[PDB]
Design an enzyme around this catalytic site. Structure first.
Site, short mmCIF file in Angstrom:
data_model
loop_
_atom_site.label_atom_id
_atom_site.label_comp_id
_atom_site.label_asym_id
_atom_site.label_seq_id
_atom_site.Cartn_x
_atom_site.Cartn_y
_atom_site.Cartn_z
CB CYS B 18 -0.97 0.03 1.19
SG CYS B 18 -0.17 0.42 2.78
CB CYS B 29 11.68 -11.29 14.15
SG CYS B 29 9.89 -11.58 13.86
CB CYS B 37 -3.00 -2.96 3.53
SG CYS B 37 -1.29 -3.51 3.24
CB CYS B 60 7.81 -23.75 -2.21
SG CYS B 60 8.10 -22.90 -0.66
ZN ZN Z 1 0.23 -1.86 3.72
ZN ZN Z 2 7.51 -20.75 -0.72
#
Ligand code: ZN
Ligand code: ZN
Ligand code: ZN
Ligand code: ZN
EC number: 2.3.2.31
Lengths: 76, 215
Positions: B18, B29, B37, B60
């Site tokens: 945004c 972290c 948003c 993945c």
């Molecule tokens: Zn945002």
């Molecule tokens: Zn991934």
């Protein structure tokens, strides 16, 4: 949340985890950063052997905790 | 001393979704969540953080976790380097960096690192100096924060950490980004194999696309 993993060599890495992460997930992150296959990894925390199906929160592993990595050796 | 003062002062952080601007509060972290948003992203490289089983990238290997995919020059990876090797990347490219504290520096209340963090105290949060041990030659910072500083220079100058990889790190990187476990072809000797991997990596896998750079 961040945690540390060290080997007996003294080399330490930092992992990004959440408390809900399985031990399997953590081994997968170590593989990502270090190239070590999960099947070759034994992790220990406070003297306890960490088992694959459990989570970091199961072992009361908090932010900034240090895990120990020991390699596994299997016969042919 | 320009590089350090910039790291030390209060920094901005922008949501890549945004575009709302924030003041970065250090101490948490690398996982950020936009309060405007709710978009999740990495402070190190601005790439998205997906919930488990929501990641769109194929092949993945960490699909079952909250993770993002970070480039090789994100702090996510580079924070694991020694300060010496990060210094080498900078030296190899003639980038100056601080090893001593600022010129007319002000003493830090307790001891330790001067980096201000928003710390977790009993029943809330509190701004406070890091206070961790500061090794000589770390410019008055602690080990982790000094590396962060060196990484800010490295990123700003578009330096490639791969120029310093050993063959094992090249293989780990090749597998991460190209999803193939490489091996020497027949007739290839170790110097040629290393050089081949560094060249294949350079040309197929760019540095972080969303890491702000200098000119
Ligand atoms: Zn945002
Ligand atoms: Zn991934
Ligand atoms: Zn990142
Ligand atoms: Zn510090």
């Amino acid at each position: 949340m961040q945690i540390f993993v060290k080997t007996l060599t003294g080399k330490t890495i930092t992992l990004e985890v959440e408390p809900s992460d399985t031990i399997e997930n953590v081994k997968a992150k170590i593989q990502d950063k270090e190239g070590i296959p999960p099947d070759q990894q034994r992790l220990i925390f406070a003297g306890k052997q960490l088992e694959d199906g459990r989570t970091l929160s199961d072992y009361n592993i908090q932010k900034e905790s240090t895990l120990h990595l020991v390699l596994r050796l299997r016969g042919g | 001393a320009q590089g350090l003062a910039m790291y030390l002062q209060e920094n901005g952080i922008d949501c890549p979704k945004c575009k709302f601007s924030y003041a970065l509060a250090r101490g948490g972290c690398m996982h950020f969540a936009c309060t405007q948003c709710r978009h999740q992203f990495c402070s190190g490289c601005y790439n998205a953080f997906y919930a488990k089983n929501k990641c769109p990238e194929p092949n993945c290997r960490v699909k079952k976790s909250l993770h993002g995919h970070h480039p090789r020059d994100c702090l996510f990876y580079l924070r694991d380097w020694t300060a010496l090797r990060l210094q080498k990347l900078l030296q190899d490219n003639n980038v100056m960096f601080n090893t001593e504290p600022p010129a007319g520096a002000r003493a830090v209340p307790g001891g330790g690192c001067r980096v201000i963090e928003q710390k977790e105290v009993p029943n809330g949060l509190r701004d406070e100096a890091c206070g961790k041990e500061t090794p000589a030659g770390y410019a008055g910072l602690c080990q982790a924060h000094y590396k962060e500083y060196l990484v800010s220079l490295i990123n700003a100058h578009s330096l490639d950490p791969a120029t310093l990889y050993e063959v094992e790190e090249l293989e780990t990187a090749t597998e991460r980004y190209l999803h193939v476990r490489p091996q020497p072809l027949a007739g290839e000797d170790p110097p040629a194999y290393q050089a081949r991997l560094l060249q294949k990596l350079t040309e197929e896998v760019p540095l972080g696309q969303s890491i702000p750079r200098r000119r």
